[PDB]
Every structure is written in structure tokens, then in C-alpha cells.
Amino acid sequence: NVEFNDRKLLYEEWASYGVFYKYQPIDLVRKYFGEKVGLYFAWLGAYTQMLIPASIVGVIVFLYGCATVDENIPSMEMCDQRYNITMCPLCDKTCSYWKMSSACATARASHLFDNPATVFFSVFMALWAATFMEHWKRKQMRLNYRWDLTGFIIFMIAVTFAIVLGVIIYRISTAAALAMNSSPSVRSNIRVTVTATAVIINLVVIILLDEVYGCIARWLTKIEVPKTEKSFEERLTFKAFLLKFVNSYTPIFYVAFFKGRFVGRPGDYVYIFRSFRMEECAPGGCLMELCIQLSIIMLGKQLIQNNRYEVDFNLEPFAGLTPEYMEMIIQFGFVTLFVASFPLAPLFALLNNIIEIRLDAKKFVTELRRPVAIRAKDIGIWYNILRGVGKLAVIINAFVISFTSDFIPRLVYLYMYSQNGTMHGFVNHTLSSFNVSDFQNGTAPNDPLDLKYDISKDFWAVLAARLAFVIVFQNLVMFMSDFVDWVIPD
Amino acid sequence: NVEFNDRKLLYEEWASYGVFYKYQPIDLVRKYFGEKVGLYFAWLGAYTQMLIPASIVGVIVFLYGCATVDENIPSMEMCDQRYNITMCPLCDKTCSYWKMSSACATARASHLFDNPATVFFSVFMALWAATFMEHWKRKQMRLNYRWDLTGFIIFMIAVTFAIVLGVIIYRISTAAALAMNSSPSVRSNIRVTVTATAVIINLVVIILLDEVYGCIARWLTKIEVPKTEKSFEERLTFKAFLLKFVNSYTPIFYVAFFKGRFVGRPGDYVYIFRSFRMEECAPGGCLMELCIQLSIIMLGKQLIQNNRYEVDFNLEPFAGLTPEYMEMIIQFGFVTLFVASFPLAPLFALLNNIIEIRLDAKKFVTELRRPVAIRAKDIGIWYNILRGVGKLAVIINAFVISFTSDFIPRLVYLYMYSQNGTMHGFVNHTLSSFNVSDFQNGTAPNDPLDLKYDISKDFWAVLAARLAFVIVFQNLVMFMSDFVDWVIPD
Ligand SMILES: [Ca+2]
Ligand SMILES: [Ca+2]
Numbered sequence: 020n021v022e023f024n025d026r027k028l029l030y031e032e033w034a035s036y037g038v039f040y041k042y043q044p045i046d047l048v049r050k051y052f053g054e055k056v057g058l059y060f061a062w063l064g065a066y067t068q069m070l071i072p073a074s075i076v077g078v079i080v081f082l083y084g085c086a087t088v089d090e091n092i093p094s095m096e097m098c099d100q101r102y103n104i105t106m107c108p109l110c111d112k113t114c115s116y117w118k119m120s121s122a123c124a125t126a127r128a129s130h131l132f133d134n135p136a137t138v139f140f141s142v143f144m145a146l147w148a149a150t151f152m153e154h155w156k157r158k159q160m161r162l163n164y165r166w167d168l169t170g171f172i173i174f175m176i177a178v179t180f181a182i183v184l185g186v187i188i189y190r191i192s193t194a195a196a197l198a199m200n201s202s203p204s205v206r207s208n209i210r211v212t213v214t215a216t217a218v219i220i221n222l223v224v225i226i227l228l229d230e231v232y233g234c235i236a237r238w239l240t241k242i243e244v245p246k247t248e249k250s251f252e253e254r255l256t257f258k259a260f261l262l263k264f265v266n267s268y269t270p271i272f273y274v275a276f277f278k279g280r281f282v283g284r285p286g287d288y289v290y291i292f293r294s295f296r297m298e299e300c301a302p303g304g305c306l307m308e309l310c311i312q313l314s315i316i317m318l319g320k321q322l323i324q325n326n327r328y329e330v331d332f333n334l335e336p337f338a339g340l341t342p343e344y345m346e347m348i349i350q351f352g353f354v355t356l357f358v359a360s361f362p363l364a365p366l367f368a369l370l371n372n373i374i375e376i377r378l379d380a381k382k383f384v385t386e387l388r389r390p391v392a393i394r395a396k397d398i399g400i401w402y403n404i405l406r407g408v409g410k411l412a413v414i415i416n417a418f419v420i421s422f423t424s425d426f427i428p429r430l431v432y433l434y435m436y437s438q439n440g441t442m443h444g445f446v447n448h449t450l451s452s453f454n455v456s457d458f459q460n461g462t463a464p465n466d467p468l469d470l471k472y473d474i475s476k477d478f479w480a481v482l483a484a485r486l487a488f489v490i491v492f493q494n495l496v497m498f499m500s501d502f503v504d505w506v507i508p509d
Numbered sequence: 510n511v512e513f514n515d516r517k518l519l520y521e522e523w524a525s526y527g528v529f530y531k532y533q534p535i536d537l538v539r540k541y542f543g544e545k546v547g548l549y550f551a552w553l554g555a556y557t558q559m560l561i562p563a564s565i566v567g568v569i570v571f572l573y574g575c576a577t578v579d580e581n582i583p584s585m586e587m588c589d590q591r592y593n594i595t596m597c598p599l600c601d602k603t604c605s606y607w608k609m610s611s612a613c614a615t616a617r618a619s620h621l622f623d624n625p626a627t628v629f630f631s632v633f634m635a636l637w638a639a640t641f642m643e644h645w646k647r648k649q650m651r652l653n654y655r656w657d658l659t660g661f662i663i664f665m666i667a668v669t670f671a672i673v674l675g676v677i678i679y680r681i682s683t684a685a686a687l688a689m690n691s692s693p694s695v696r697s698n699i700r701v702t703v704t705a706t707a708v709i710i711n712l713v714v715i716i717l718l719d720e721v722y723g724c725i726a727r728w729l730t731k732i733e734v735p736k737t738e739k740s741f742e743e744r745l746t747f748k749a750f751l752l753k754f755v756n757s758y759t760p761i762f763y764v765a766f767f768k769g770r771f772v773g774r775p776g777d778y779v780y781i782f783r784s785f786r787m788e789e790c791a792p793g794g795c796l797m798e799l800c801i802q803l804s805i806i807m808l809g810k811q812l813i814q815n816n817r818y819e820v821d822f823n824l825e826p827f828a829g830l831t832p833e834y835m836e837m838i839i840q841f842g843f844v845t846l847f848v849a850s851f852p853l854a855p856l857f858a859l860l861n862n863i864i865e866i867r868l869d870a871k872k873f874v875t876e877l878r879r880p881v882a883i884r885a886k887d888i889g890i891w892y893n894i895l896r897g898v899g900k901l902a903v904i905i906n907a908f909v910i911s912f913t914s915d916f917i918p919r920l921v922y923l924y925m926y927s928q929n930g931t932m933h934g935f936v937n938h939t940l941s942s943f944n945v946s947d948f949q950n951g952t953a954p955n956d957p958l959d960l961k962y963d964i965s966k967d968f969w970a971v972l973a974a975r976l977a978f979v980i981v982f983q984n985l986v987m988f989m990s991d992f993v994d995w996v997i998p999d
Contacts, residue, residue, distance in 0.1 A: 483969050497900075
């Protein structure tokens with residue numbers, strides 16, 4: 020049945036348009052391919068199945084996004100008429116009412132969600148990622164338990180990270196490449212497609228630069244000479260992962276945190292409100308949620324949109340499972356580390372990962388022609404990374420969520436002194452922009468009102484609650500995950 | 510050798526004045542007493558031995574405290590002449606210069622340390638406690654590994670915690686009991702001994718109330734009826750521990766955090782500076798470090814200062830090892846959870862624990878007359894608590910250390926604009942008290958200078974860095990402990 024070993028893995032692992040729609044034969048992969056090869060699919064099967072509860076709620080958070088802001092309209096009106104104000108000292112009879120309508124359309128996607136919708140799903144997903152950490156740990160105690168029964172100097176690396184983390188203008192060059200590849204100055208779909216193009220300019224060159232680090236890490240680990248060939252690869256991954264970590268996520272880390280930070284431009288209100296790209300592209304909306312919304316979409320989708328044994332010598336060799344491990348944990352850190360801005364990040368992984376099983380199943384049958392049946396153990400070298408990413412999960416998204424949806428639910432608690440918490444708690448969408456542009460550019464300029472001097476002290480009050488949210492978050496969610504670590508495996 | 514079983518544990522475990530000075534025969538305890546009984550002494554042996562590196566540095570932090578503030582005198586002068594100012598609107602020819610000299614003596618102990626001495630040892634000890642968590646884990650993998658080879662409704666509880674955490678005026682009554690048991694109004698040694706007395710009034714009654722919770726927890730767990738008698742005791746500890754946790758540490762949790770918080774008294778500078786206990790006891794120094802210094806001393810020391818078998822029926826029974834487990838983890842949480850104010854908390858545990866081996870060794874030979882040789886396994890039901898206390902360690906002392914020694918190393922970075930970071934960085938001891946009384950009573954009253962309104966916004970700036978220190982702390986020290994969790998057991 021060596022032919023039927025191919026055929027049952029040809030036919031039942033054929034489809035590559037969508038689901039197989041028969042079953043998911045993870046056992047058949049372990050019947051043939053091997054416990055190294057099978058525990059990649061067993062994980063990616065379990066990862067696909069556990070994205071289904073996550074993706075449905077991402078639709079419900081879309082539905083609680085879409086319906087509860089179209090029906091009662093509490094955060095379109097307050098959010099379109101926020102951005103109707105954000106250019107009122109830009110007008111002065113020169114290019115008056117342009118980017119507001121662009122800004123009023125960004126707020127339909129961004130400010131659809133902020134305070135209930137982003138936050139409740141993130142606390143869910145960080146618990147879910149810890150649950151998925153726990154459920155896979157029980158699945159390790161069910162699949163590897165089933166598998167164990169069937170078995171019967173280093174400153175050069177820190178130099179290269181300063182190189183690789185110094186490779187950020189390379190993103191800004193690609194952010195400038197699409198600024199001249201098409202160069203439109205419009206508001207309907209210009210900024211949507213130009214930032215779509217630059218991510219595509221990134222993903223082409225980053226994958227070219229992803230192959231650079233492999234030739235960097237292989238010669239560098241051969242220079243260090245570890246004696247054991249097992250820990251040689253273990254040093255090789257942790258070298259090359261951290262290279263590919265800081266290759267792949269540093270565009271996002273730039274645009275989540277550092278692209279918005281570190282900038283305060285002088286010339287108060289008359290010159291603060293205008294001077295971004297000469298008043299035409301986007302001082303209507305800075306809104307860095309969308310640049311994280313648009314990037315992870317193209318980062319999630321275009322893994323697809325780019326891609327008797329005498330003939331077996333004519334083809335590329337096997338053992339590409341350590342990039343394959345890596346290729347999905349780059350996507351696991353897209354889901355879990357960054358689910359605050361857009362919550363359908365499971366489904367853009369889910370629609371992806373349905374093909375990505377069958378894309379990689381077909382890549383292991385009709386390509387990469389040596390199914391060795393290696394059957395080694397211990398995927399845990401990435402599970403150590405995954406928990407560490409999961410430890411970074413409750414840190415990083417708490418540093419994502421507590422800089423976007425904590426402007427407003429404390430500005431409930433300044434201007435609503437008399438009457439409300441929620442109902443006229445939507446009135447403090449706008450006046451936070453009348454305060455100004457809520458970042459470091461925006462809590463500073465009320466000194467021409469009162470006579471950066473004193474009003475940049477209300478910046479600290481949010482920055483208190485910014486830091487107070489995280490210290491509540493990574494303590495509760497590490498305590499909520501202290502529940503889930505004990506409930507499941509017994 | 511049944512007599513010699515007694516005699517070798519009589520004679521080699523006799524001394525009870527200090528060290529045995531022969532050896533520490535942990536094996537002989539496991540040769541006779543049992544792996545339940547022995548792994549208490551094996552832990553308390555390892556806990557005593559690992560306090561020796563901690564206690565020496567506590568002397569060095571005392572030496573870096575004592576010498577570097579007596580020789581160069583940079584934080585006596587700046588700290589005595591801080592407190593020479595803190596009553597200058599109290600004087601007004603009525604009880605002028607009294608409590609300054611009391612305050613100038615509190616600052617010799619408190620402000621001996623703050624910014625280098627407390628902080629460097631805490632980061633050391635929180636790493637050390639994680640190291641001691643790791644070293645005992647390797648000792649578990651060496652002692653229990655040696656031992657495993659030789660082996661061949663619940664709302665009623667949450668009601669009672671609201672009772673027990675509601676039992677805090679009981680501390681304040683004992684804080685008022687010593688206020689009338691002697692009632693002096695002096696400054697040399699009145700506040701030192703009155704607060705020494707009230708802790709003694711606590712430790713008498715708390716131990717009386719510690720026995721109350723056992724009769725509470727035993728009937729309450731018998732009311733819940735767990736079927737398995739093993740998990741019956743496991744529910745019993747976690748009921749009674751959390752009772753004795755909130756019995757014992759809630760005086761400290763009160764005086765660390767909540768006794769200083771939640772109080773802002775109106776009537777600015779003329780009435781703010783004076784109105785604590787009518788200007789005679791201690792508006793010279795509030796200084797809640799000492800109340801945590803003095804309490805843990807009496808909490809650490811006075812475990813001592815209060816305390817052919819026909820005759821065996823005339824004595825109290827065995828199986829008091831679950832309070833004995835508890836009695837030391839109350840002391841482990843004295844060391845690790847609270848080492849920021851006074852750093853010799855290892856040595857006041859160390860001098861204690863040298864006797865506390867021989868006190869409890871003699872209590873198991875000449876008293877409690879049944880050494881059953883039970884030899885059961887798994888101390889880990891408290892190791893789960895201990896890591897949880899150790900997880901609370903990096904939280905709580907970061908909430909201890911970042912409210913005392915973060916007044917000043919950011920007030921380096923207000924008034925030293927021109928010339929210094931450290932040398933005239935001692936000049937901002939005083940002006941923080943000229944700001945006022947650095948807590949919530951103290952960042953508020955500059956509104957009669959400028960015309961609570963606006964100057965309570967520099968409170969947030971510290972409260973930023975208060976929260977910013979913790980979020981640096983419990984992330985770095987959980988990353989520094991990510992090193993130590995991998996270095997030792999391989
Ligand atoms: Ca793939
Ligand atoms: Ca004892």
C-alpha cells in the first residue's frame with residue numbers, strides 16, 4: 020500500500036480550495052508521515068479547530084461592532100463629528116473640508132469598537148491563548164501520550180540584532196517606495212491602497228531578507244562550534260527565530276508603538292493641526308489602528324497569494340519543517356500578540372489555515388519528495404517559545420489595548436461630572452480631539468489657551484491608567500490563566 | 510537502637526541556644542522521622558543555608574547604609590535638614606522645635622538606604638527568592654529523588670474572608686490598646702516602644718484568633734463534605750491558610766499600603782503640617798517604613814520569646830506539621846514579600862531559624878511523642894503556595910519599593926536641571942517636603958502658592974513612575990528568573 024500511502028494522502032489531502040469536507044485524518048498522517056511531521060499537523064489541526072470559537076466571536080464583535088453603532092448610532096455621530104472638528108483650524112479658506120470625509124470613514128471602522136468590543140475579546144483571547152496553550156498541553160498529553168506508547172562569540176549575535184533592529188529605515192524606505200510607486204493625493208481609497216502596497220513591498224523583500232538570515236545564522240552557529248548536533252540546531256533556531264522575529268514583527272512593533280510615539284511637533288494649534296504631509300493626505304486621521312489592521316491582513320493572507328523513485332532526485336530536499344514551525348508561529352503571534360485593533364484576526368488566520376493545511380499537505384506529497392517517517396519526539400522547543408510568546412501576549416496586547424481604548428473610558432470621568440457614565444459618555448469622543456489629537460502631539464498644546472507647560476500633566480493621568488490597566492491586565496489574566504492551567508489536564 | 514534513635518536525635522539535636530556546631534544531620538532525620546517530617550527539616554535546612562548569602566548582604570547593605578551615609582554624610586545632612594523644615598509652619602511660638610529631633614533620628618535609620626540600598630537588595634532577593642524557588646526545586650529533584658528511590662457552599666468562605674478582612678479595626682483597637690496601655694507623649698523612645706507594644710498586643714491576640722480559624726475551617730470543610738479525605742485536608746489548608754494569610758499579613762498590608770493611603774486632610778499648609786495627633790507625637794515623621802521595620806522584627810523574633818511508652822498517653826498528639834509548614838511560610842512571606850524597607854530580614858529570620866530548627870527538633874523528640882515514620886511524599890501543596898507567594902513576591906515588594914524610594918530618584922529629574930544627577934541629587938531630599946509630605950497629603954497643597962487644583966498633577970508623574978517601576982520590575986525580574994529557571998536543574 021505504498022502507492023495507497025500516497026493515494027490516501029493524495030485524495031483525502033487534495034482539495035486546496037477550502038476544507039477537505041470529509042474529515043481531518045491526523046492519525047493517517049501519523050500512520051504514515053511521522054511524529055515530527057504529524058505533530059506539526061496535529062498542532063495546526065488543533066490551532067485551526069480552536070480558531071473556530073475565536074473567529075465566531077470575532078464576527079460577533081464585528082456584529083456588536085456593526086449593529087450597536089448603526090442602530091443606536093452612539094459612536095458614529097460622536098466619532099464623525101469628532102473628526103468634523105479635527106480640521107477646523109486647518110480650513111481658514113485654504114483646502115477647508117477635505118480629509119474630514121476620509122476621517123469620518125476611518126472612524127466607521129476604527130471607532131466602531133473601542134471600549135467594549137476590542138477589550139472584551141482581548142481578555143477573552145489572552146485567556147483563550149492561555150487556554151489554547153493549556154488545551155494543546157493537554158493535547159500534548161493526549162497526542163504525544165498516544166505517540167509515546169507507539170514508540171515501543173555571542174556578542175556577534177547581539178551585534179547582528181542591533182543590525183537587524185537597526186534595519187527599520189528599510190521599512191521606511193518601503194513605506195517611501197509605495198509613496199512614489201503610485202503617489203496619489205486623495206482621500207477615498209488612496210491611503211487604503213498605498214499602505215496596502217507598501218506592505219506588499221515589505222513582504223516581497225522581507226522574504227528575500229528572510230533567506231539572508233539563514234545564511235547568516237548557519238555560518239554564525241558553525242563559527243561558534245557547538246559540539247552536539249542536536250543543540251546545534253537548538254542554537255540555530257533560537258538564533259534564526261530571533262532574527263526572523265525581529266525581521267517580521269518589527270514593522271508592526273514600529274507602527275503599533277514607535278511610529279506614533281517620539282514625535283511632538285512645535286508650532287501650536289494653527290501649525291499642530293495641519294503640518295502632517297502638507298494638509299492633504301491624513302491630518303484628518305492619523306489612526307494607527309488601521310495600519311495595524313491593514314498590515315496583519317496582508318501578513319495573514321499573502322502566505323497564499325505569492326505561493327520507482329528515479330524522478331525524486333530532480334527536486335528540492337526535505338526537512339523544511341523548522342521554517343514551517345516558524346511560519347505559523349509568526350502567524351500565532353499575529354493572532355494573539357496583536358488582537359486588540361481588529362478582532363477577526365482569527366478568521367483571517369482561519370480561512371488561511373484551512374488552505375494552509377492542504378497547501379502544506381500537498382507540499383508534502385506532490386513536492387518535497389521524501390516522507391522519511393522520522394518519528395522523533397518533543398515539539399516543545401517551540402512550545403517554550405510559544406509560552407514565551409504567550410507570556411509576551413499578555414504584555415504586548417496590554418500595551419496595544421491600553422493606548423487606544425483608554426483615551427475615552429477615563430474621559431468618561433472628566434467631562435461627565437454632572438450626568439452620565441455611558442449615555443452622554445459618548446460626548447467625550449469629540450472633546451478629546453478638542454483637547455488635541457490624543458497622543459504626545461495632543462495632550463501638550465493647551466498652553467496657548469491657559470498660558471507643554473502644565474497641560475501635558477493630564478497626559479500622565481492617562482499614562483497612569485495606561486500603566487494601571489496593564490498592571491491589572493497581566494496580573495488578572497495571569498491569574499485567570501492560573502485557573503485554566505489547573506482545570507483542563509485533570 | 511530505638512533508644513539510640515532517641516539519643517542521636519536527643520544529643521545531635523539538643524543545643525537550642527544556637528547552632529548545633531557539629532553538623533546538620535538531615536539524613537538522620539530521614540533515617541528516622543519520615544519523608545513528611547524530614548522534608549520539613551530539609552526545607553528549613555535549605556532555607557537556613559540560603560539565608561546566609563542573603564543575611565550577609567543585608568549586613569553589607571547595612572554597611573553600605575551605615576558607612577556611606579556617615580563618611581560622606583550625603584543623606585543625613587540632606588535628611589536631617591529635610592525634617593528641620595517639616596515643622597517650620599508648625600512652630601509659630603507654640604511647641605516649636607520638638608519632633609524634628611525625633612524626625613532627625615528616624616531619618617538616620619529610614620533615609621540611610623533609600624535609593625541604592627533598598628533597591629539593589631530587593632532585585633537581588635526577588636531573584637534570590639526565585640533562585641531559592643529554583644534551588645529548592647533542584648533540591649526537590651535531589652532530596653525527593655533520593656527519597657523516591659528509597660521508597661521501593663463556597664460563598665460561606667468568601668463570607669468569612671469579608672469577615673476576616675473586615676477584622677482590621679481589631680488591629681486598630683490593638684493600635685489603640687497600647688495607646689492607653691502606657692500612653693506617653695515623648696519623642697526619644699516613646700513611639701518606638703508604643704508601636705513595639707501594640708505589635709505584642711497583636712501577636713498575643715492574633716495567635717488566640719489563629720486558633721479560632723481552625724475551628725472555623727474544620728467545621729466548614731466538614732459542612733462542605735469533600736469525599737476524598739486527602740483533598741479534604743487539601744481543601745482544609747487552602748481554607749485555613751488563606752484565613753491565616755489574611756490574619757497575619759493584614760496588619761502589614763494595612764501599614765504598608767492602606768494606612769498611608771486614603772487620607773487627604775483639608776486645611777492647607779498651616780493646618781496640614783500640624784493636625785496629626787495634636788502636633789506632639791509624630792508630624793515630625795510619619796515614615797511608615799519603620800512601622801514595617803518594627804513589626805516584622807517582632808513578627809520574626811517572638812516565635813521564640815513566647816514559647817516502654819506508658820507515659821506517652823499523657824501528652825498532646827502528633828500531626829502538627831501543617832501548622833509548622835504554615836508557621837514558616839508566614840516567615841517566608843516576611844522575608845521575600847517585604848524586603849524593601851529593612852534588608853536584614855534574612856538575618857532576623859536566620860538567627861530565628863537556627864533556633865527554630867533546634868526548637869522544633871526538640872519539640873519532636875522530648876515532646877509530641879509519636880515519631881510514626883510516615884514517609885509520605887509531595888510537599889508540593891505548599892510549593893504551589895510558595896511559588897504563588899513568589900509570584901506575589903515580585904508584585905508586592907514592587908508595590909513596596911516603588912512608593913518609598915521613587916519619590917527622590919525622579920526628583921533628581923525636576924530640580925537638578927542645571928548641575929547634577931547624584932552629587933546635588935541629595936538636595937531633593939528636602940524640597941520634596943517643601944513640596945509637601947510626599948504622599949497623597951503632600952502633592953496636593955501648593956494651591957495656596959499658585960491659586961488639589963493643579964499641583965496634584967505632579968502626583969501622577971510619580972504615580973506614572975511608581976507604576977512604571979513595577980511594570981519594569983515584574984517583567985525584568987520575571988525575565989531574570991527566566992534565566993535562573995533554566996540554569997540550575999541541568
Ligand atoms: Ca506553509
Ligand atoms: Ca515551630
